[PDB]
Ligand binder design. Structure first.
Ligand SMILES: NC(=O)c1ccc[n+]([C@@H]2O[C@H](COP(=O)([O-])OP(=O)(O)OC[C@H]3O[C@@H](n4cnc5c(N)ncnc54)[C@H](O)[C@@H]3O)[C@@H](O)[C@H]2O)c1
Ligand SMILES: NC(=O)c1ccc[n+]([C@@H]2O[C@H](COP(=O)([O-])OP(=O)(O)OC[C@H]3O[C@@H](n4cnc5c(N)ncnc54)[C@H](O)[C@@H]3O)[C@@H](O)[C@H]2O)c1
Ligand SMILES: NC(=O)c1ccc[n+]([C@@H]2O[C@H](COP(=O)([O-])OP(=O)(O)OC[C@H]3O[C@@H](n4cnc5c(N)ncnc54)[C@H](O)[C@@H]3O)[C@@H](O)[C@H]2O)c1
Ligand SMILES: NC(=O)c1ccc[n+]([C@@H]2O[C@H](COP(=O)([O-])OP(=O)(O)OC[C@H]3O[C@@H](n4cnc5c(N)ncnc54)[C@H](O)[C@@H]3O)[C@@H](O)[C@H]2O)c1
Ligand SMILES: CN(c1ccc(F)c(O)c1)c1cccc(-c2cccc(O)c2F)n1
Ligand SMILES: CN(c1ccc(F)c(O)c1)c1cccc(-c2cccc(O)c2F)n1
Ligand SMILES: CN(c1ccc(F)c(O)c1)c1cccc(-c2cccc(O)c2F)n1
Ligand SMILES: CN(c1ccc(F)c(O)c1)c1cccc(-c2cccc(O)c2F)n1
Ligand SMILES: OC[C@H]1O[C@@H](O)[C@H](O)[C@@H](O)[C@@H]1O
Ligand SMILES: OC[C@H]1O[C@@H](O)[C@H](O)[C@@H](O)[C@@H]1O
Ligand SMILES: OC[C@H]1O[C@@H](O)[C@H](O)[C@@H](O)[C@@H]1O
Ligand SMILES: OC[C@H]1O[C@@H](O)[C@H](O)[C@@H](O)[C@@H]1O
Ligand code: NA
Ligand code: NA
Ligand code: NA
Ligand code: NA
Lengths: 253, 253, 253, 253
């Protein structure tokens, strides 16, 4: 209840799923949280539910939305300590030949450039507060995934960008880290499974892909984010895996 | 002289630097090579120098240039076995706050989407020949680099995309691998060093960054590419480091 | 003060350095802690200092010492939730030709087999409590270090063993993770530096090896351990880097 | 036929399996090869079969056997250019609680210390020839394996030791690299499968564990070793994966 007391946190895509889990974890740690989302429904309800959280409508692909997000955060709360770049999307499974350069550009705009833009606008304030950046990447950036060339590329870019920015901001005392979740049960997971011939089988397969035998929860990603913000003062440029062990483990012609 | 006899290889950015080293290595292995470059000077001379290599002017950011590159390769040589996506650029050192979203988009167009576009157009022919893709990424995609947020992000994306496509093309017998060079002495390296206050010191520092005490050569990247194409039949989705050991090795307040 | 209330933790090598930092972090989280060490001086004082911590003399290379450590922990506290395998040593710098197979065997006994033995004896109790194992490995297991072939080998073994055991214990609900610290300012660090021609220069070089510009503290490793035990319920088989960014970042003949 | 002409190579465990594949690849590259094995049957036949290969009985766990192996190599051929540390063993599947410290020590003697001992005795000669070391590790050192805690630990140690020694020998011009194979069809693979309830199912599962849909061949590991010895002059401290993509790719309670 006090690990991050007096601090101000912005969470993008905070209206549902992992983002909402991160919002709740930071509020529970004593922080004030700005919920950014492009959709009003979940984030507005979350603002009413949680004392200490407020909602600001902001599409992270729109530079002027992001400029206003930062200026309103400072105007309302007087400081900025942590930026969690969680907004992102996974398209449905797509064979490589079914992808397009334009679809790839659009996914880069959200998953990569939206993270870049908010971070850039927030860094002057994070320097003043010796704050930190947390990017939500993905395990599949590191190990690959089938039928997801554009998505995987965007997450490889986020993980690498995290390390580069960690180097650049280290002299100024600003840490930059990422979390790479595996299968987390969220509305996006539920939506993608509903597109499949047998959604139930797809979900069962998703649970069994982890040695722990279940999918992860938004709250577990949230606890990892609070650790990185509040207690990981010698960690910068790390990739914190929250995957349940999915990356572990496993005639000649 | 026979390791890759009878095969046809396309090398992007083949007119100088690493690309030219790769062209030479494939010609020396017995292959016919198409040198793709946006600039005529080096590639045209290389075509006159090397029996077995020809030059095609092609800017990999221009989709119609790439369509013609593939169709002319097939028209002239009847098959396509290997695509080496080497074209790319490193901008001068840039602090994060000096970068722009537009500059980042432009670098993604070259370093990431040009690789994506040629690979996509070539894959139908690579499937027919059980051929392979070799992407030239960078060590700094894996470990980061200072004053290079956009560049590092593009190379993290290439390495990750390599793994995704390896998964997708494995059922069809097409391998997809990448090479991550470190400091290789090329005209780009020489150009970036010339921008520095003390170019000589910058170069000395570049040599000393490797345990081997020198920078690498285009020919060494070329030998790695020939290995991946011609002899690495059980390797797919790998990142082959050609870095001289730069990634190895290295009061409390 | 309540994150790990009601839990029982064993920390090997807990009498000074990182181990003592981990002991303090767990006591501060509400746990009861058993301090294991082969030397009485630091651990006995720590027991007098901290309500909630007790000291048991135990050399982790001696199987009967470890059997008694576990049986006394259960006899005194009725449960066991977490085992932190921190005991270990770094020999002075040794050129490869100056090492011996016997010295290598002895270092394996401590850094690898002592971790193995305690974990094995503790696992039946950790299964009953759905507890977890935390091994203290090293960044240099992943990236190498000069003049330390035996040490580096032992830490590569610990990190790999962590992943194997994570797979084996996942069906039983026991998580197994490791922390890989970089330069942490401890009595071992101070002792090794004192062996050098210029200890002050060695220390300055150690601080500058991290982008953060300082060495880490035992308390920071301790916070990472408490996170892994108490809040990382979807993490198993991970390597949590606590290195200050040392692994990030960096004529041809 | 000339890539490694005039060079002298020692391959441990060269009498069958991967080792024999490596022997054949080096003979085919023009080298003279010393086949080391603890068993006479396969290696003696291989010596009769291959002009350019000879067999020396040597158990790599016996220091005096290894001393004689090196001295006889020099006495007979006048130089030593490459040492391939391939001898090793995988025990049958063993649950962690079924392993013993003594069994673990014995496996370390073979898989780790035998590699260490030959490398140490060979390094003075490798320095004279600017030669190189190739260690045969395993993919499972990096990602883990079930029911194999000791084996996985030994291979994590080999991969890490490779990086440490690469750092130490870089000033002297000696490269040190490793190959991490995945499922390679060898007599050890066949022996382990024969211990299983359904050996046929075990083998089918082994083939399907790779995106390429088959196991690898000794010849493919051999080609990777010849590349590392003869053409990878800017590679040191690398881990070359020969795994067919096994490491790629993949309700909340
Ligand atoms: N769910 C998983 O298994 C999983 C695994 C690995 C990584 N991730 C990553 O975690 C993040 C969150 O995923 P999720 O499963 O919670 O997804 P989700 O779709 O359930 O939630 C994403 C939220 O982001 C918002 N958002 C989308 N585009 C936005 C934009 N332009 N501007 C502002 N907000 C925007 C959405 O409205 C939504 O509220 C994403 O980056 C995703 O790539 C998820
Ligand atoms: N030199 C190094 O140290 C180093 C290190 C790691 C990775 N790399 C990568 O290796 C690749 C080659 O680098 P280099 O040092 O040889 O560079 P270079 O600048 O010397 O050569 C690059 C070549 O690509 C061509 N090219 C550029 N844009 C193109 C386009 N749009 N279409 C077609 N051709 C185009 C250029 O005209 C040039 O001939 C790049 O991907 C670079 O990122 C280089
Ligand atoms: N200090 C660093 O920079 C650093 C970096 C990476 C990893 N590590 C690892 O962290 C761990 C702790 O290192 P440290 O710097 O705190 O060392 P330290 O020497 O300051 O403390 C080690 C403690 O372990 C105890 N110990 C040693 N052998 C023992 C045995 N056989 N049985 C029981 N206790 C034993 C010692 O008596 C001592 O109290 C080690 O595993 C080390 O390899 C340290
Ligand atoms: N087969 C695979 O799928 C696989 C996968 C990854 C790694 N590996 C590694 O590859 C290496 C070779 O494996 P393999 O499948 O060919 O095994 P194998 O059992 O078929 O052949 C091993 C050879 O080494 C010899 N050998 C064993 N102990 C020895 C000793 N003390 N001294 C000298 N020679 C000795 C054996 O007599 C045999 O000829 C091992 O290090 C193994 O760990 C194998
Ligand atoms: C939410 N998401 C996901 C999963 C894991 C990650 F690491 C990640 O970043 C995102 C989902 C959700 C449902 C199915 C699939 C999915 C699986 C296999 C191939 C694909 O193309 C997929 F889309 N992926
Ligand atoms: C060619 N290039 C390069 C080097 C290594 C790589 F792995 C890579 O992909 C590219 C260069 C060339 C000269 C100086 C620098 C460079 C160094 C440190 C920060 C920077 O911003 C740099 F630009 N980089
Ligand atoms: C405590 N220790 C250490 C440091 C970093 C680690 F990741 C680690 O596991 C241990 C020390 C302490 C002082 C000097 C050196 C050291 C440095 C370079 C070569 C060597 O051989 C060394 F011994 N290492
Ligand atoms: C030869 N070997 C092997 C396989 C892959 C490697 F990367 C490696 O280093 C060795 C075998 C052969 C047959 C079955 C198994 C095996 C599989 C799953 C759990 C185990 O305990 C096993 F023993 N492993
Ligand atoms: O829709 C799947 C899951 O999404 C998560 O974000 C919510 O917290 C869960 O209540 C829900 O079951
Ligand atoms: O310009 C730096 C270097 O670039 C390389 O691509 C050329 O092969 C060298 O001859 C040249 O010295
Ligand atoms: O000896 C170096 C350092 O060791 C740490 O374990 C102690 O907490 C510090 O007080 C001390 O300065
Ligand atoms: O025993 C399995 C396989 O082992 C390999 O080393 C041999 O080259 C093959 O001929 C054999 O089928
Ligand atoms: Na509120
Ligand atoms: Na020509
Ligand atoms: Na006490
Ligand atoms: Na012979």
């Amino acid at each position: 209840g006090t690990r991050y007391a007096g601090k101000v946190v912005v969470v993008t895509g905070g209206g549902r799923g992992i983002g909402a889990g991160i919002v709740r974890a930071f509020v529970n740690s004593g922080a004030r949280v700005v919920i950014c989302d492009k959709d009003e429904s979940g984030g507005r309800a979350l603002e009413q539910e949680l004392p200490g959280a407020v909602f600001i409508l902001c599409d992270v692909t729109q530079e002027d939305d992001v400029k206003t997000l930062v200026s309103e955060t400072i105007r309302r709360f007087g400081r900025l300590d942590c930026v969690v770049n969680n907004a992102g999307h996974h398209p449905p499974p797509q064979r490589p030949e079914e992808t397009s350069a334009q679809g790839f550009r659009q996914l880069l705009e959200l998953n990569l450039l939206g993270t870049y833009t908010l971070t850039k606008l927030a860094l002057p304030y994070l320097r003043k507060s010796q704050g930190n950046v947390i990017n939500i990447s993905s395990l599949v950036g590191a190990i690959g995934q089938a039928q997801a060339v554009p998505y995987v590329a965007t997450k490889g870019a986020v993980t690498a960008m995290t390390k580069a920015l960690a180097l650049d901001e280290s002299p100024y005392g600003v840490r930059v880290n990422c979390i790479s979740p595996g299968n987390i049960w969220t509305p996006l997971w539920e939506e993608l499974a509903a597109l499949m011939p047998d959604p139930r089988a797809t979900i069962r397969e998703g649970m069994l892909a982890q040695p722990l035998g279940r999918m992860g929860q938004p709250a577990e990603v949230g606890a990892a984010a609070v650790f990185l913000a509040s207690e990981a003062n010698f960690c910068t440029g790390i990739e914190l895996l929250v995957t349940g062990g999915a990356e572990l483990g496993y005639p000649d012609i």
